[PDB]
Design a protein around this ligand. Sequence first.
Ligand SMILES: COc1ccc(C(=O)CSc2nc3c(=O)[nH]c(N)nc3[nH]2)cc1
Ligand SMILES: COc1ccc(C(=O)CSc2nc3c(=O)[nH]c(N)nc3[nH]2)cc1
Lengths: 272, 260
Amino acid sequence: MKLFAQGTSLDLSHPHVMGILNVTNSLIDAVKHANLMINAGATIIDVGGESTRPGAAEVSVEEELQRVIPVVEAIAQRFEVWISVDTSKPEVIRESAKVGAHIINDIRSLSEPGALEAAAETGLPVCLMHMQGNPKTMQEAPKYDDVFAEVNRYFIEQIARCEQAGIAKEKLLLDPGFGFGKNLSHNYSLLARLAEFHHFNLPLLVGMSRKSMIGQLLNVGPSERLSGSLACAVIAAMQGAHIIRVHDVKETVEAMRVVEATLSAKENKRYE
Amino acid sequence: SMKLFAQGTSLDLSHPHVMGILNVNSLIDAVKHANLMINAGATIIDVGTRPGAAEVSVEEELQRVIPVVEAIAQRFEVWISVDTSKPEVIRESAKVGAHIINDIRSLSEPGALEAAAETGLPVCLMHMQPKYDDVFAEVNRYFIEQIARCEQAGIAKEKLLLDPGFGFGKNLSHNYSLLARLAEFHHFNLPLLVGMSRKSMIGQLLNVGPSERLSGSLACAVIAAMQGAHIIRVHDVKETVEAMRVVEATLSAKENKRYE
Ligand SMILES: COc1ccc(C(=O)CSc2nc3c(=O)[nH]c(N)nc3[nH]2)cc1
Ligand SMILES: COc1ccc(C(=O)CSc2nc3c(=O)[nH]c(N)nc3[nH]2)cc1
């Protein structure tokens, strides 16, 4: 299993760690943070300029472009690392790809007018994430009769939508969207059944780092979540998740080495 | 449903337990460290004597170990595991409140087997000897043998725990083979105890020193717990307990309650 972008490839025969670069002197600091994450073993850096948090306010196209594009450009011309861009906006998609981004990682799964066409036009890999509702209301009262089945159905529908628009399946990644319109019990159901999403034969991307599913379980603040975060990452990686999106790159990469050593000693290379 | 009974209390093995390592006033500090581990969520304290270490006389081992076991048993509700190979220490430990006899030698010293049987306590069987054909099969064979040896001495199967003995005459790939296949040891229907905390199986993989192995140790604990391991022996209790609550939340959402 392999992705292709910007003349290079990413080998997903083992887990990859994706370092979070939140850009909600800004430029110099962001590039220093990327550099530390690459040194710590991150092979993808995820650049995001619009808060995707519960209650988040929208940012203008011009402001997002100012936050994001100079960060993507600077990273693409200094390091060899892959770059994902965390955006919903057709223009940010286009401009990001122009300055070297490798993956479009939209929490809205290209739902914004023109996003689907912009993504297709780039030829880049696209991550389809499940979210119930939108960031302003998703956490008010998340509700499912069957969260796994409903996220599974969403991925069937969005894969088709993307194929229809000329995005080949081989470009797609799937992410169940931990914390995006889910209560604590919904999140743990998806984590527990994560391996079952492999039936699509597509890369799985997960992001649990420092999230509420750890916070509300342990009743701790956001700086006390490293152990819980590593536990989530290891649980996901043991079930064959391909990309783990995190704040704490060094510790995660170390945990992924242990997983890799364990999976390579196993006959069928996956827990289920 | 799996439970152990000792000293008037029970251990509920329907979820994983964290066992904190206690290195042996010396007695005041041992109590203080026990207190810290209980506060971090350890439900078993392992009292002991690594491999390579200096052998000691019966008398010295009693003087080191018995007051500690006794002091913990008098002050705390926690279960107490004792790492010893000597029949005298097994006997005296049980008299002052130990719950589990954890012998790294699996009761091979003369008299140890009989002493353990007399106590009526739970007994942990650990594999120790690196070259193997199928490390899993050898360990598995060892368990069958030791179980039989214990049952023959009047130790009921319901008192036994199995430990594959990570780091103990095992190289890097043998250790990870045993970890990858841990869940297969459930066919005995006995509790599984594992100890990988800060070991060279992490140190060598990662090329880091003994104090930089927490993340790898946590990974090992999670990997074992996801496969239904019952007791995880660690140095870093708070962090392991947190990781275990995440495992527990995951396994409770799973209809199978285990990964294989
Ligand atoms: C303090 O509590 C926190 C709440 C939220 C965070 C975030 O980082 C949320 S942004 C985010 N998540 C995902 C994801 O899961 N998958 C993908 N594909 N993209 C994502 N983007 C961090 C901490
Ligand atoms: C730096 O390299 C290290 C080498 C060794 C250590 C130890 O703590 C090993 S003593 C020990 N292990 C076990 C075990 O696995 N199971 C049981 N049941 N009892 C045990 N007693 C730590 C670090």
